[PDB]
């Protein structure tokens, strides 16, 4: 369950998720990677579930690079509570995802095994993904 | 020293160290005496004795040194006096150097307390001496708790070799 | 019950006369909390860093000096 060790502020504005992921869309650490093709939110539990699935499939024979970190807190009201009376309490952490953002990379396994692991992990995610490989430019 | 240094050691060191210009010949600039008399706030008489000690060993008035920044681990406040220092230049530092080297070095019970090393890497040498005695001042009687000194001599010598040559020319044990 | 809910009254800072305008002596040019702009020729500085004109003329902004300070002056 990834989460920042400490934060400068506790609660943040909702914001709007727009635009494409020009940064963080290039394979840098491994040889094969999975990237999102539509935008959304990615929770820490989702990140952990996908990582566990990939590691279990590849039997820890390679290295998995996680390139998403959930540094955005999300609040909810305590339930049965009326509107107003201040902002709600922090409940979980998410990472904003834009189309093109790379989520996981794998180093040191066969392409077939890596693609099987990525197909297994894609079923755990709330958005559509695709598979990319390292290229010269 | 002064004149003796000028006549002998200038040319002697120039030939020894193969220095092309007389301006690069090592020279002694200043001598600094310091004591970090900590916890002086408790008694407030050890510092007063210390300034008298400095007036005795060096014929110069002492200047009391204040603490910079306040440390809770120690008991030093922001600006309380926690040390004493004097600075000697010109003929007076020569007098102090000659007087100390001649008479104080034999008087200490131990010997070879000062190495040929302990330069700061730039031709300046620091001394740590214990016991206010071994100087031309009254003995154990009529003096207060014994105190030690730090004696930092700063030279124009660029590195440790010209430092060592210059000070051995004066006659330091090592 | 929230522990927040306070704020101060507005202060209405900012540039009052822009470059190219004509001024009369005494006109306030810049209201500022600190010296975002510095006083050039024919411009005076008040106790609260307000910049005002000390002569009639045309206001001009510039960047000048070895620190790259912003200056505003009045040209007669």
């Amino acid at each position: 369950m990834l989460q920042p060790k400490r934060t400068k502020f506790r609660k943040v504005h909702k914001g709007r998720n727009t635009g494409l992921a020009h940064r963080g869309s290039t394979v840098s650490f491994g040889s094969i990677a999975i990237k999102a093709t539509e935008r959304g939110r990615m929770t820490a539990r989702q990140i952990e579930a996908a990582r566990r699935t990939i590691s279990r499939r590849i039997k820890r024979g390679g290295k998995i690079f996680i390139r998403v970190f959930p540094d955005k807190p999300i609040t909810e009201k305590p339930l049965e509570v009326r509107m107003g009376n201040g902002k709600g309490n922090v409940e979980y952490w998410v990472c904003e995802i834009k189309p093109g953002k790379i989520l996981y990379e794998i180093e040191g396994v066969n392409e077939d095994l890596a693609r099987e692991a990525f197909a297994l992990a894609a079923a755990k995610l709330p958005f559509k993904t695709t598979i990319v490989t390292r290229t010269v430019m | 020293l002064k004149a003796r240094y000028n006549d002998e050691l200038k040319a002697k060191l120039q030939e020894e160290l193969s220095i092309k210009n007389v301006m690069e010949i090592p020279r002694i600039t200043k001598i600094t005496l310091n004591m970090g008399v900590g916890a002086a706030a408790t008694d407030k008489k050890l510092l007063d004795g210390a300034v008298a000690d400095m007036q005795l060993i060096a014929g110069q008035k002492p200047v009391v040194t204040l603490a910079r920044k306040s440390i809770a681990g120690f008991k030093i406040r922001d600006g309380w006096p926690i040390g004493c220092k004097v600075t000697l230049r010109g003929d007076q530092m020569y007098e102090f150097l000659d007087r100390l080297i001649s008479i104080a070095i034999p008087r200490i019970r131990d010997f070879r307390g000062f190495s040929a090393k302990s330069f700061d890497g730039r031709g300046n040498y620091s001394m740590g001496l214990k016991e206010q005695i071994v100087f031309p001042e009254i003995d154990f009687d009529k003096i207060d708790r014994i105190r030690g000194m730090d004696i930092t001599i700063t030279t124009t010598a660029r590195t440790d070799d010209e430092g060592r040559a210059l000070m051995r020319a004066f006659g330091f044990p090592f | 019950s929230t522990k927040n809910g306070r704020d101060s009254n507005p202060k209405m800072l900012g540039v009052k006369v822009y470059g190219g305008q004509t001024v009369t002596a005494g006109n306030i040019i810049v209201r500022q909390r600190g010296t975002e702009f510095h006083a050039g020729a024919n411009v005076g500085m008040g106790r609260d860093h307000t910049l005002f004109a000390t002569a009639d003329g045309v206001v001009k902004f510039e960047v000048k000096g070895q620190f790259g300070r912003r200056y505003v002056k009045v040209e007669t």
Binding site: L20, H22, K35, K98, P99, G100, V136, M137 | - | -
Partner: protein, 97 residues
């Protein structure tokens, strides 16, 4: 001489955001050619040919020929822009060599 890219001149009326989007809707790719002793020249490439060439690995370390009309330029690829989500090439840079 092994790699030859047939191109067309990309004029001022074909430069700009809207013109580039129209070109890419036509399945064409904008590119620029710059290098010592001559002014830059803007050209239009075919997406099909660009993808075919990029599939080869020796294309990134070999002198290639961009041919527009009768003019011929000997260049090496310098930079490429891809779509963040679709990986389609969108713009090319070519340094004279």
């Amino acid at each position: 001489a092994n790699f030859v890219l047939n191109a067309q001149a990309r004029a001022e009326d074909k430069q700009g955001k809207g013109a580039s989007r129209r070109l890419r809707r036509e399945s064409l790719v904008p590119a620029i050619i710059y290098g010592g002793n001559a002014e830059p020249v803007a050209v239009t490439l075919e997406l099909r040919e660009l993808v075919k060439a990029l599939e080869s690995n020796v294309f990134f370390e070999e002198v290639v020929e961009i041919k527009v009309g009768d003019k011929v330029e000997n260049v090496k690829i310098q930079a490429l822009q891809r779509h963040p989500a679709k990986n389609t090439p969108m713009h090319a840079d070519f340094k004279r060599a």
